[PDB]
Design a protein around this ligand. Structure first.
Ligand code: A1INW
Length: 128
């Protein structure tokens, strides 16, 4: 299903071309701007371990997930991936641990060396 599709077909959006962050655009967005470092960004998301065994969503809190891009408030893979997204876009990301929580992990939610999958909808972004 979705994570395997991203393995198979996604674009490697890493600078190092190490396949650490793979992307598919699932729904195309509007306009020419993409976020840049410093922007306040608003998303809805659905995440899970690519194994499938935990499944976290902004909708579980009935409100958008808000963060400042490139301020290390989210994992490196979000700073990289959301920077590529247009407003209204829905994208699938598949993320190696190097761009997420690494060999240390983040227990109890995230084990060591975890690959992560997200669907992200970019709702809006505003310049600091
Ligand atoms: C490692 O801890 C969590 C990881 C994740 C969600 C968490 C975590 O809290 C213990 O709580 C969800 C409550 C809302 N929320 C999200 C954040 N802050 N509050 C950003 C997090 C502090 C860091 O999260 C991230 O960088 C990414 C991207 C933004 C959305 C949440 N992220 C996660 O890694 C999720 C994770 C997704 C895979 C399945 C388990 C939860």
């Amino acid at each position: 299903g979705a994570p395997a599709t991203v393995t198979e077909q996604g674009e490697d959006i890493t600078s190092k071309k190490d396949r650490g962050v793979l992307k598919i655009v699932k729904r195309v967005g509007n306009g020419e701007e993409t976020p840049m470092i410093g922007d306040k960004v608003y998303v809805h998301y659905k995440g899970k371990l690519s194994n499938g065994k935990k499944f976290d969503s902004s909708h579980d809190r009935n409100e958008p997930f808000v963060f400042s891009l490139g301020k290390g408030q989210v994992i490196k893979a979000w700073d990289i991936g959301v920077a590529t997204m247009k407003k209204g876009e829905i994208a699938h990301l598949l993320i190696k641990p190097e761009y997420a929580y690494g060999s240390a992990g983040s227990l109890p939610k995230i084990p060591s060396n975890a690959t992560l999958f997200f669907e992200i909808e970019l709702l809006d972004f505003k310049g600091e």
